[PDB]
Write a protein that binds this ligand. Structure first.
Ligand SMILES: CCCCCCCCCCCCCCCCCC(=O)OC[C@H](COP(=O)(O)OCCN)OC(=O)CCCCCCCCCCCCCCCCC
Ligand SMILES: CCCCCCCCCCCCCCCCCC(=O)OC[C@H](COP(=O)(O)OCCN)OC(=O)CCCCCCCCCCCCCCCCC
Ligand SMILES: CCCCCCCCCCCCCCCCCC(=O)OC[C@H](COP(=O)(O)OCCN)OC(=O)CCCCCCCCCCCCCCCCC
Ligand SMILES: CCCCCCCCCCCCCCCCCC(=O)OC[C@H](COP(=O)(O)OCCN)OC(=O)CCCCCCCCCCCCCCCCC
Ligand SMILES: CCCCCCCCCCC1=C(C)C(=O)C(OC)=C(OC)C1=O
Ligand SMILES: CCCCCCCCCCC1=C(C)C(=O)C(OC)=C(OC)C1=O
Ligand SMILES: CCCCCCCCCCCCCCCCCCCC
Ligand SMILES: CCCCCCCCCCCCCCCCCCCC
Ligand SMILES: CCCCCCCCCCCCCCCCCCCC
Ligand SMILES: CCCCCCCCCCCCCCCCCCCC
Lengths: 322, 100, 298, 162, 131, 475
């Protein structure tokens, strides 16, 4: 089995496996990082005792989550109940599989690209829907209805917010998208696409301020009330992986991806992705939660016309300069 | 090297399955689901035909097909809402008082 | 609907009667059995027919939801039973009595002096504010006119605990609206107040420090240093809370126009304090019926 | 390519057969999701990448609306399952079974006589579909916008409360 | 070629290992640790008191009209997705077509907003009474 | 190919109807005004009707692969525009009694008229599919416009489900045809053939299933009396005239242009469908006490007569002008009959007046409406001095020229059965039974003008013959 083609195949497979393991590790260590960064933003420390600087807090949480009683309620639809954390873990991981983290480091150089991300987000809503319905809990059903309402709010304009970047690159492929930002990052021309994608991508992960399915103050944590043990941990690890994926996609589409003047390309990609991960934490710490009817009104009356007008203006600019 | 006949046969199987579901189900929601299966099978047949000829027209007809499917599902859900509001049941045999 | 409101439905007797025994040790110790647990859990279960509520319309069913006693937004042992049409509240029944401590019955059970710590725990974020009307009413019974220094000490402790309670209230409102950060800083401000309050009274939450005829001790040497430190610390923190949270338009959209009532509704329900004065009725006890030397402050 | 086509088609056939003969509506919606994912995999195996992407994209939203309506009306525990199971009898399905079978037999007999050189599966890009869509098919785009407008107006007029 | 089939294998292994890791963590959570036994353990959580009814009910959502409209608007979005990847090839004539399409879309949206089709807030939650 | 300014000039009624759809909808968004929105809709339809003159001055040419504009498209666009204008005129006094919102009716009528114009100009399988759905879906809304009633909701659900099924059938047939041929244009359906390829024939059979549903042709006809009775009476007017006329026009164009129109198997299947349609539609209307169901079975029979004229399209040369003359006469007679039904049901008060006991003795309170309705019953019967006879005479001449003797005998037998039930209605008008607004008067003027046109062109048909012979497509 000594051939350049085969060893290139295993090299690509090994690079994909490394990307997958690093993304899952970043989700778990960013549960820990959310705790530490919230401590930083709130003039405190967060977990800094278990290990050096709290570095073993994630290990202790993982051991506790594994040896917790992982139960399935007798009143629940058992197969759907077990299936919902699997969807929550896998959907935005698969969405990460199109992110080019470096030249030569991408799992899937798909022709559809950002279309595959839209596919995975549209699949990702069903995790919360199935968790809310199957658990046979009133608060969880209210959370599932709120999650569907949220999906109505953002999915109408998420892809349209990406369409200006798609129009400028002339392609759905994400490597072409980062190559079209060789001179100017897309946050400058596609600024309105950037803010609408920021809103819709925060709403994709059901992160605060769009945590209405899991609203603690209203629904007492909502759709995942009956979950415990590693199914609950699956929901939150999938949420943090979704934060990682949305931040990396924001970097890839609007901030040049890995392109930068001095540092190695992965250093630039990791720095920008870490900045937007921190921004996820900071907006969780900073701003209050709107009512979900107000969120639906904002998505349908403000964001969607903004994305349509942005696409029209972007096309007029492109055809004027061609 | 997929034969065109195999794709057409798969689309025909899905079409007749959706038609059977439309006939044998009294619930209006399952009838709408069978209608969705029918139109999706016809759109799959168009995609197969477009891929055999190497033409974009198969996917263009697919796009028009799912636009019709979306608007038809919208109208069917509105009518199902009216049937549930005005009958408290989704039995399609109950709405049969015009005859002869 | 003349049913019990403090005691469970399967309660025998009327506890504020003079022949009803006060102490729990008069009766058998609490023995939770399976039959008793099933009985009192049946008695706690909401019955919508007893409150004139239907189970739904013809088109849809109403969801009867327990908002409490264990809910993050219920401020204690407190249940509201929500009749929900989707997310709309058709009607609600607030179910109280889960925090009944028999404090009035205990008032008949303790001496005039030994009852003061119970007055502290009537409104447990209030402290010396709760002590003040009791000691003033006892001093009316005793024919006592306290000196001016007592009046100023009691006013200062009352205003410190009013700031403590208001800090908790504002931060928890912001937390309930959705922004969780200002509660950390506001409890730091509460710790500055508690530095002064611990130094003066020896205790944080329930000082039990007012006395019939005065206060328990003189002010310790160096209290003014702690008061000056808190008065320097507070206003920048409060301005930061205002700008960061209370002037955020999402918080305004969550709160402005929400659960609104006017002067007539405030008067007919006995609403006092900030709700009544929010209706425009300028009624504060410290101005209308001045007590404890509050007339000497501007 | 043929591996993906045959396995995705088999999964789509089995999931659709599970859909039309199922009692629980939420389970039926999940099998419908699985069947549409499988048909999208069939689309990807034939080189119709845009059609497969749009198949997952717009049916994930559409079945979400179906779930909303199922939660609004159908889900009641075992009451709707018992009512739906009593609606299905051996006679009720065996009636249209031969009708669908002979329709499939006639359609398959007509299919098997056509000239077939095979589908090579060369990808037809989304850019080419966009060029054709806004090229020769301009009137299709504008009148499809009018069709979706009509769907909007009909849905608003019918599906209201008062 | 070879990079394409290498990326196909990488995508396959990525999906397989991700699903297998999820299943492995589910199995490890299921089998490790003890189990609790209680009389009311298998009762759904509703803040410590028994339910009135259950979660299996005809709970009427208020945004169902917006759900129909969302399905329609997602199909319009895919038409614009097809346009946006080939803007330079379609030229100004394709721009005029998409401008007409987007204008009809926006007129339908304006019509839906103005007739109150997108409003489902109850009257006591519309926040009319402010200072 | 692109869109030339000349192509835009040929696109004028489509552009005007789409623009007035947008304008009427924006006016609805601004403020609900029943009078203003009805006026804007009829102004747009009249503007398209008078822009037909500029379309005629342009000439006959192709607009994209999807559309072809010739005199045939002009004639059928004019027919569907007249049907839509009459539907709006009948709809206003009916909608005056409607408590809910009335302005969406005209929006749905305009979008359905747009679908009719597209079917008039359709040269493509994509155009045919899109025109069919652009007609059908606004009719899902219009048939169930009074969804607060049992019958309108029943008719809406039946029409919606069955038309979705027919659209799926038609789309699968189109896909099979495309898989055989490789082109979706009408002229290329059978160019690569030996014309009886099994997949092409099966595709055209499934398209025949969908199109025969839309044309109420046996055995895809069972929806017709239910949906005609359940729907509001102006909706029944539109569904009987514009949908049938536009779909039969695009079917004529498809069978004229496609090389598989000359296949013998398709001709035999269509002959069987036409025979069964004529006989069954006439037989089922014999014992109908409801005027709407009777007119539905009547529509089945009349579409059977038109199908007879379509079967002889490849053989003779008179078939297309026969279809034009027949469709003009049938449009005017159906407008008169369904308009008298609408004006008797106006204003809306719940259940419409559709029983024959309601129309029994109509002459003693509404003499003009009784005269119009009896003229329409004579015309639908194919009695001389009416335009319906001129259409029946054209159908018989076309059938005799092609030696379709079974269809000729079917037309004679069905005409006798029709004589029975039409004369029953017409004489029940004159037995003995046991408004005040200018829009109602406009509806009365419309049915009176239709009656006078039916009488005059039955006596003197030559102007209609010359007009229809002028409306010739591209060979
Ligand atoms: C079990 C899964 C086994 C692996 C499945 C195949 C993975 C690779 C793949 O999908 O490749 C097909 C296609 C390649 O597309 P591309 O590389 O852009 O083009 C090559 C020539 N133009 O890429 C595509 O078609 C990409 C879109 C399909 C990916 C689906 C992944 C699963 C989604 C549902 C999860 C639930
Ligand atoms: C990599 C991904 C992560 C990236 C991280 C960084 C970006 C994070 C983005 C966070 C987005 C939060 C968006 C929140 C939208 C809330 C809109 C809403 O519903 O507001 C409601 C409120 C009052 O509602 P109203 O309609 O007036 O009242 C009707 C009452 N029935 O209405 C109002 O208060 C009106 C004003 C609404 C303002 C909307 C928010 C503006 C945009 C987000 C904040 C800025 C983020 C940074 C942007 C780039 C800056 C360079
Ligand atoms: C049981 C689990 C699911 C199994 C079905 C889906 C995976 C099938 C196996 C795919 C393995 C990869 C493969 O065969 O790729 C071939 C082809 C890639 O495209 P191409 O560039 O033409 O490749 C040939 C080289 N030129 O591949 C393709 O074109 C199609 C790529 C795979 C299909 C997309 C994913 C389908 C997901 C189905 C979900 C079903 C419900 C769960
Ligand atoms: C209150 C406001 C009221 C507003 C008015 C409403 C009522 C009146 C409506 C007026 C409509 C006018 C339509 C005019 C169509 C014909 C225009 C024309 O000039 O056609 C001529 C053209 C052939 O001549 P030429 O132009 O020289 O062509 C050479 C090569 N192109 O001819 C052709 O190519 C074919 C032309 C014939 C096509 C059919 C005619 C149009 C549709 C008529 C439908 C109704 C017919 C049945 C009723 C007949 C009654 C007598
Ligand atoms: C490999 C498996 C590792 C499992 C580790 C799970 C750790 C979950 C912590 C997430 C979290 C939860 C649940 C949480 O409730 C919370 O409070 C709002 C946080 O912030 C302080 C969190 O970070
Ligand atoms: C979680 C990070 C620190 C914030 C601490 C929570 C804020 C203060 C708690 C308010 C509160 C009070 C007083 C309270 O009494 C109560 O009932 C038990 C609650 O519901 C659970 C409350 O939320
Ligand atoms: C917070 C950043 C999260 C990144 C997640 C994705 C990273 C996947 C693993 C990438 C490993 C290889 C990096 C590139 C190697 C070549 C360059 C080396 C010098 C920087
Ligand atoms: C209460 C009303 C229920 C209506 C159910 C209708 C079911 C119809 C099933 C028809 C099955 C036909 C099977 C084939 C028959 C032979 C071929 C067609 C006739 C020649
Ligand atoms: C016994 C009284 C009979 C009165 C009959 C009146 C007939 C009026 C006919 C008017 C014209 C109708 C259309 C004829 C063609
Ligand atoms: C019920 C309808 C009966 C119609 C009879 C028509 C008879 C036509 C016979 C044609 C024979 C042609 C022989 C050559």
């Amino acid at each position: 089995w000594i051939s350049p083609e085969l060893i290139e195949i295993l090299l690509t497979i090994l690079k994909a496996v490394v990307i997958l393991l690093v993304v899952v590790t970043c989700g778990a260590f960013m549960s820990f990082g959310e705790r530490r960064l919230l401590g930083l933003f709130q003039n405190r420390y967060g977990p800094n005792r278990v290990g050096w600087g709290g570095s073993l807090q994630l290990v202790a949480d993982m051991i506790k989550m594994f040896f917790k009683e992982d139960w399935i309620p007798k009143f629940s639809d058992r197969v759907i109940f077990t299936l919902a954390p699997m969807i929550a873990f896998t959907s935005l991981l698969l969405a990460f599989a199109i992110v080019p983290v470096s030249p030569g480091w991408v799992v899937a150089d798909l022709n559809i690209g950002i279309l595959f991300f839209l596919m995975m987000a549209g699949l990702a809503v069903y995790a919360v829907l199935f968790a809310g319905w199957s658990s046979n809990n009133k608060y969880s059903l209210l959370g599932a209805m709120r999650a569907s309402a949220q999906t109505l709010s953002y999915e109408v304009f998420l892809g349209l917010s990406l369409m200006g970047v798609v129009a400028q690159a002339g392609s759905f492929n994400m490597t072409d998208i980062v190559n079209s930002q060789a001179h100017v990052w897309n946050v400058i021309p596609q600024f309105f696409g950037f803010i609408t994608f920021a809103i819709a991508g925060v709403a994709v992960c059901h992160r605060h301020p769009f945590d209405q399915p899991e609203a603690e103050q209203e629904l007492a944590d909502g759709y995942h009330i009956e979950y415990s043990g590693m199914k609950f941990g699956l929901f939150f690890v999938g949420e943090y992986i979704g934060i990682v994926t949305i931040s990396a996609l924001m970097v890839t589409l609007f901030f040049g991806g890995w392109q930068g003047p001095l540092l190695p390309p992965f250093i630039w990609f990791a720095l920008k992705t870490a900045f937007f991960m921190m921004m996820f934490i900071l907006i969780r710490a900073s701003l209050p939660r709107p009512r979900y009817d107000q969120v639906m009104s904002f998505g349908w009356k403000i964001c969607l016309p903004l994305t349509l007008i942005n696409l029209l203006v972007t096309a007029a600019v492109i055809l004027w300069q061609a | 090297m997929i034969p065109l006949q195999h794709g057409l046969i798969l689309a025909a199987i899905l079409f007749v399955l959706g038609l059977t579901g439309l006939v044998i189900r009294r619930n209006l929601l399952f009838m709408l689901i069978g209608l969705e299966i029918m139109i999706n099978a016809s759109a799959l047949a168009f995609v197969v035909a477009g891929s055999y000829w190497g033409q974009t027209d198969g996917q263009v007809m697919y796009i028009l097909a799912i636009s019709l499917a979306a608007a038809e599902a919208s109208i069917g859900l509105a009518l199902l809402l009216q049937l549930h509001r005005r009958r408290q049941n989704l039995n399609i045999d109950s709405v049969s008082e015009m005859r002869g | 609907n003349l049913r019990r409101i403090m005691m469970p439905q399967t309660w025998k007797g009327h506890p504020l009667r003079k022949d009803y025994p006060a102490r729990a040790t008069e009766f058998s110790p609490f023995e939770l059995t399976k039959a008793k647990q099933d009985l009192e859990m049946e008695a706690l279960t909401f019955k919508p027919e007893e409150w004139g509520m239907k189970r739904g319309t013809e088109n849809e069913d109403f969801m009867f939801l327990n908002l409490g006693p264990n809910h993050p937004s219920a401020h204690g042992a407190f249940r509201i039973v929500l009749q929900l049409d989707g997310e709309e509240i058709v009607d609600c029944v607030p179910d109280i009595g889960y925090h009944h401590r028999g404090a009035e019955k205990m008032g008949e059970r303790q001496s005039w002096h030994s009852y003061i710590p119970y007055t502290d725990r009537i409104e447990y974020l209030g402290g010396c504010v709760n002590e003040m009307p009791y000691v003033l009413a006892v001093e009316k019974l005793a024919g006592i006119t306290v000196p001016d220094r007592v009046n100023v000490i009691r006013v200062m402790l009352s205003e410190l605990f009013r700031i403590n309670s208001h800090l908790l209230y504002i931060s928890t409102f912001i937390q309930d609206v959705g922004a969780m950060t200002p509660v950390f800083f506001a409890f730091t401000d509460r710790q500055k107040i508690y530095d002064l309050v611990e130094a003066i009274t020896g205790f944080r939450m329930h000082p039990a420090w007012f006395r019939i005829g005065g206060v328990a001790h003189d002010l310790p040497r160096g209290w003014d240093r702690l008061l000056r430190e808190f008065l320097d610390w507070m206003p920048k923190r409060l301005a930061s809370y205002e700008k960061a949270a209370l002037q955020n338009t999402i918080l305004k959209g969550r709160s402005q126009g929400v659960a609104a009532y006017g002067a007539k509704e405030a008067l007919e329900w006995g609403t006092t304090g900030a709700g009544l004065r929010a209706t425009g009725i300028d009624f504060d006890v410290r101005k209308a019926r001045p007590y404890s030397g509050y007339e000497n402050f501007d | 390519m043929e591996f993906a086509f045959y396995i995705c088609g088999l999964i789509a056939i089995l999931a659709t057969l599970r859909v039309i003969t199922h009692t629980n509506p939420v389970h039926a919606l999940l099998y419908l999701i699985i069947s549409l994912l499988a048909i999208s995999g069939v689309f990807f195996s034939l080189g119709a990448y845009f059609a497969g992407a749009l198949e997952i994209i717009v049916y994930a939203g559409a079945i979400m609306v179906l779930f909303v309506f199922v939660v609004m009306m159908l889900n009641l525990g075992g009451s709707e399952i018992e009512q739906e199971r009593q609606w299905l009898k051996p006679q009720v399905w065996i009636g249209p079974a031969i009708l669908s079978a002979i329709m499939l037999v006639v359609i398959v007999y007509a299919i098997l006589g056509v000239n077939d050189q095979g589908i090579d599966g060369t990808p037809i890009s989304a850019k080419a579909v966009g060029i054709t869509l806004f090229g020769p098919y301009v009137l299709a785009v504008e009148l499809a916008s009018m069709l979706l407008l009509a769907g909007l107006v009909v849905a608003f007029h019918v599906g209201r409360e008062e | 070629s070879t990079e394409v089939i290498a990326h196909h294998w990488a995508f396959a292994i990525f999906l397989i290992v991700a699903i297998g890791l999820c299943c492995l963590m589910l199995v490890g959570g299921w089998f490790l640790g003890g189990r609790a036994r209680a009389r009311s353990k298998n009762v759904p959580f509703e803040s410590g008191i028994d339910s009135v009814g259950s979660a299996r009910l005809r709970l009427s959502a208020k945004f169902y009209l917006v759900a129909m409209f969302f399905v329609i608007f997602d199909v319009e979005a895919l038409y614009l997705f097809a346009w946006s990847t080939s803007i330079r090839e379609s030229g100004w004539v394709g721009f005029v077509e998409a401008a007409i399409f987007i204008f009809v879309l926006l007129a339908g949206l304006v019509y839906l907003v103005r007739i109150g089709a997108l409003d489902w807030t109850p009257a006591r939650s519309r926040r009319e009474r402010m200072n | 190919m692109t869109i030339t300014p000349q192509n835009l000039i040929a696109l004028l009624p489509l552009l005007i109807v789409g623009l007035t759809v947008v304008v009427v909808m924006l006016s609805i968004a601004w403020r609900r005004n029943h009078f203003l929105n009805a006026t804007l809709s009829v102004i747009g339809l009249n503007a398209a009707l008078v822009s037909l003159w500029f379309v005629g001055q342009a000439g006959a040419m192709d607009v994209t692969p999807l559309m072809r504009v010739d005199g045939f498209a002009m004639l059928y666009t004019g027919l569907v525009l007249l049907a839509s204008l009459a539907t709006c005129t009948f709809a206003y006094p009916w909608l005056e009694g409607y408590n809910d919102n009335k302005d969406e009716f005209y929006l749905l009528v305009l979008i359905a008229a747009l679908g009719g114009i597209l079917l008039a100009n359709a040269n493509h399988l994509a155009s045919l599919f899109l025109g069919i759905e652009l007609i059908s879906l606004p009719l899902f809304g219009l048939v169930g416009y009074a969804f607060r009633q049992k019958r309108s909701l029943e008719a809406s659900i039946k029409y919606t489900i069955l038309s979705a099924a027919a659209s799926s059938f038609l789309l699968f047939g189109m896909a099979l045809v495309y898989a055989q041929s490789g082109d979706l244009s009408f002229v290329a359906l059978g160019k690569n053939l030996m014309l009886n390829e099994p997949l092409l024939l099966a595709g055209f059979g499934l398209m025949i299933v969908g199109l025969g549903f839309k044309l109420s042709l046996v055995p895809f006809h069972l929806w017709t009396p239910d949906v005609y009775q359940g729907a509001p009476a102006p909706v029944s007017t539109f569904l009987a005239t514009a949908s049938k006329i536009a779909i039969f026009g695009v079917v004529m164009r498809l069978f004229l242009y496609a090389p598989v129109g000359d296949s013998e198997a398709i001709r035999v299947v269509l002959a069987i469908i036409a025979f069964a349609s004529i006989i069954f539609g006439n037989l089922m209307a014999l014992s109908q006490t409801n005027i709407k169901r009777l007119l539905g079975y009547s529509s089945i029979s009349h579409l059977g007569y038109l199908l007879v004229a379509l079967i002889a399209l490849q053989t003779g040369e008179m078939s297309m002008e026969a279809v034009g003359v027949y469709l003009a006469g049938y449009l005017f007679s159906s407008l008169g009959a369904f308009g008298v039904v609408s004006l008797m049901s106006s204003p809306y008060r719940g259940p419409d007046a559709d029983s024959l006991f309601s129309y029994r003795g109509l002459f003693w309170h509404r003499p003009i409406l009784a005269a119009v309705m009896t003229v329409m019953m004579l015309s639908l019967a194919g009695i001389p001095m009416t335009l319906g006879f001129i259409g029946k005479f054209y159908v018989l001449a076309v059938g005799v020229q092609a030696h379709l003797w079974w269809l000729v005998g079917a037309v004679v037998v069905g005409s006798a059965i029709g004589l029975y039930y039409y004369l029953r209605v017409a004489v029940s008008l004159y037995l003995h039974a046991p408004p005040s607004n200018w829009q109602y008067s406009a509806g009365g003027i419309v049915v009176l003008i239709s009656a006078l046109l039916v009488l005059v062109l039955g006596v003197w048909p030559q102007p209609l013959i010359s007009i229809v012979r002028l409306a010739m497509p591209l060979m």
